[PDB]
Design a protein around this ligand. Structure first.
Ligand SMILES: NC(=O)C1=CN([C@@H]2O[C@H](COP(=O)(O)OP(=O)(O)OC[C@H]3O[C@@H](n4cnc5c(N)ncnc54)[C@H](OP(=O)(O)O)[C@@H]3O)[C@@H](O)[C@H]2O)C=CC1
Ligand SMILES: CN(Cc1cnc2nc(N)nc(N)c2n1)c1ccc(C(=O)N[C@@H](CCC(=O)O)C(=O)O)cc1
Length: 159
């Protein structure tokens, strides 16, 4: 089972200038809840973006995709292809735009956080993959975060 987990603005934007363009700590808690105890797969840029205090993310087997020979990621497994990355039975792909695109075909679950923020797409932005009709979804109720942003969770699946 390969799942993808991401937080996106309603417009599909998930990253800009190498960072996530909003603050929503409740989404980080959700992320932890979903991924804890499992293998997580991320692109090298997503690895770089992790704050040092949680790089690697604790309690999870961190796997980082890179095309670089001896890319160095302490506390993580560096791999050069998706096949070497997606070997675990319960894998969560945690970003970024490139890796979500790459991994979507291997996925059977998506855990999406929609952030109700006006953020029109700009050239060069990292974007969420677009889910077609092979996916069945369940939409959660809107919630307000302490940051003032409304947000909701979506759980998608396909067999
Ligand atoms: N809102 C959210 O939920 C999340 C948002 N993000 C955001 O996403 C952005 C980063 O996304 P993006 O720029 O797309 O980068 P990625 O994190 O997807 O990393 C891309 C890197 O992964 C490696 N890579 C890609 N394809 C392959 C392949 N086929 N084989 C081997 N290595 C491969 C390369 O590493 P190399 O260059 O080393 O070869 C490439 O540069 C940031 O802005 C981040 O904040 C990230 C996670 C979650
Ligand atoms: C930059 N980044 C990538 C990140 C952020 N939010 C996401 N949110 C979702 N829904 N999905 C992702 N893949 C995702 N990835 C980060 C930054 C911090 C932590 C982080 O501190 N996390 C702690 C928990 C912290 C909290 O519980 O507020 C964890 O143990 O998972 C996670 C990912």
């Amino acid at each position: 089972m390969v799942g993808l987990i991401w937080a996106q603005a309603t417009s599909g934007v998930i990253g800009r200038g190498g960072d996530i363009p909003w603050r929503l700590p409740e989404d980080q808690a959700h992320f932890r809840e979903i991924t804890m105890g499992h293998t997580i797969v991320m692109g090298r840029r997503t690895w770089d973006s992790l704050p040092a205090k949680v790089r690697p993310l604790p309690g999870r087997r961190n796997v980082v995709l890179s095309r670089q020979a001896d890319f160095m990621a302490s506390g993580a497994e560096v791999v050069g292809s998706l096949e070497e990355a997606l070997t675990s039975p319960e894998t969560w792909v945690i970003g970024g735009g490139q890796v979500y695109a790459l991994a979507l075909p291997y996925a059977t679950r998506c855990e999406v956080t929609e952030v109700d923020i006006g953020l029109p797409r700009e050239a060069g932005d990292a974007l969420a993959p677009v889910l077609d009709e092979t996916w069945r979804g369940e939409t959660g109720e809107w919630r307000f975060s302490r940051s003032g942003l409304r947000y909701r969770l979506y759980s998608y699946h396909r067999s």
